[PDB]
Structure formats: C-alpha cells, structure tokens
Amino acid sequence: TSQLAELVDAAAERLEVADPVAAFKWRAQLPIEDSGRVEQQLAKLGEDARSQHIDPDYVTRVFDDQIRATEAIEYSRFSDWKLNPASAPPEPPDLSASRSAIDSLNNRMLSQIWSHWSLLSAPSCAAQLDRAKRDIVRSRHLDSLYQRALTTATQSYCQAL
C-alpha cells in the first residue's frame, strides 16, 4: 500500500466536487471559469503553506493542477449537457456544502503533503504515486474522465525539494 494513498484519496474526493458545482453553475447560468476566484484561492493556499513553513510555490503549483483538473470535469459535463440539456442533473440547493468540503479537503491535502514531504522529494515518489493512483482509481470507482483528471491533479507531486 502506497504511503501517498491518503493524499491521492483526498485529491480524488476533491475532484468529485466538480459534479455538484457543474450542475449548480449550469442551472444558475454561471460561468465555469472564474480567474479572480482562482487567484484568491491559490494565494490563500500559499499563505496556509507558509504558515506551516511549507514551500508556498510547490503548494500553489499542486493546487493549480488540482483546480485545472476540477474545471476540466466541469467543462466535460457542460459538453454532455449542451448535446442533451435534458440530462443536466438536479443541482444542490446552494454551494455552501461544497465550499465546506473544499476547505476540509484543502486542509487534508496540505497536511498529507507535509506529512509525506520526505517521500514526495525522494526518488521513489513516482512509483509510490503510481501505486496510489491505481488503488484510489479502484476504491473510488473512477471512470476515464476522473482518471485523466487525477493524473493532471497529481502531476507535480514529485517535485518537492
């Protein structure tokens, strides 16, 4: 079992927030893209990292990858719903629960990153990450779209110094 499995599990769970958010933005006629919100989120995560004496640039690259992967899922859903608007699913009443989940999963990922910092900077990181993705793809039943998203979201893990 990979030492990175808890981190990868948290990243995959965070990817899953794309579906309620996409459904909500579709029904509410809101854009997927929000560059100002991304800048504010990444700046805050860089400051959370600095508060814990973690390298902020490593953290903000990781979370930019994660956010791009999340947005990619939302764009894929919008493509499906453009082809068949009747298939757009019931959306959550609001995004307060999604905001809470994202905050919780941000914290879980950052704490796992620091907890395994020695491995993330070590030569075995890539192998350990491959193993973790495989196991999480199984345990969370990830389809082709989420598998690609997980690859994108984790592509900068083995960059820690």
Binding site: E33, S35, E39, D64, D65, R68
Partner: peptide, 14 residues
C-alpha cells in the same frame, strides 16, 4: 484558461 499575466496561474501550465 483565463488569467492575468501577473496571476499565480500564469506561472504554471496555463
């Protein structure tokens, strides 16, 4: 995607 040239996102894959 969308980002200003001074944004954090501008430093990375985008």
């Amino acid at each position: 995607x969308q980002f200003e040239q001074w944004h954090i996102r501008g430093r990375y894959a985008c």
